[PDB]
């Protein structure tokens, strides 16, 4: 259940930024294959300008443009494990998504700083300082904590009270509080939706990954 | 119609050298009235040192930074004509549209020297002996002479033969070969769009200051 989550999620992450460099993917198994906006995509997030990509469309092409992607990734002191530009050229979902969140990691959530705690730990401690008000509401950690959607509502409230009003929130209505933060976030911040209310409430457990992505968003247009 | 033509041109070619600093502005008629990015700008592309900013946010902090880069234009055998720092720091548009334009003159056009001939002839003349082999293409100017698009497609096939099919390109077809020109720029040769097809083929006479900054980037690309 996670692929076809993860998968939906890391498409409206990965869309969020190419639209900046006025383009859009629609299958994530698909439009990286040929590594172009791959290669875009790390020049949008990073601000760096990349090697110039090879013209043609054989085989051959793509395994060159994508290892100019994996390489530039590679210098930026990630290790890609068992991720070969073969497996993003054939189109395979598990190393496509893998190499996905290795982006989506190190470009948006590694150098995030709080009170001398980095990465996922900076990014979680950050948001619980800033859910700390709101009693209804215990960030700790990324998966179960956001289940109800409160921890996301406040997190808005908490930077805009004028788009949220969190005291009409009721804890045993999940979908609503969740919808409530995806609608105004989409609406008032111009943060796509990357996560499904039924998704996050049915599972158990909700993705961890996906939702760090998601609320990374929300730490970068605060921090602005 | 010029106004909002050379606002995008202008603002392009700034981006492609700030970005080297690290940096970018996204409103010209805002991002250069404190002087720290237009300062930022002329050490780039002369590759000197300005005196060092002012620290400060007021008005009269941004006259002093503002006058450090006029002074050092002026320095440059420029004559800045009724520009003057406080219509800079009031973000005036067309005042700021002509300081850039003869920061662009100044610095990116004014030495080129093609046989014995300087500045925009000499860019023209570099312009026609390059495309002289193309019967499809007549460069006299730098305004209606561009409007197929032809001539840029030509320009770069005459030093990247592998980059366009220009034997494909069609005369009616106006739109398509200046987007296949600005695309190969952007792609291989990385140059940044400066330009908008629509804009070049809709105006009888396409401004002539935004083709020649455009053009220089080429003259300076190829010239490496």
Redesign the interface.
Known sequence: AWEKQQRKTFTAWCNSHLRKAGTQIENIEEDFRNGLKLMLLLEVIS?E?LP??D?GKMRFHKIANVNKALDFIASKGVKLVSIGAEEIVDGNLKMTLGMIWTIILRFAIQDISVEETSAKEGLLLWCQRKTAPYRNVNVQNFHTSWKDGLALCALIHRHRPDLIDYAKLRKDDPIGNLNTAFEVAEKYLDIPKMLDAEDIVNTPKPDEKAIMTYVSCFYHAFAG
Chains 1, 2 share one sequence.
Do not use: E, I, L
Request: aromatic share 0%.
């Open positions: 601000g300008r110039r990509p013209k």
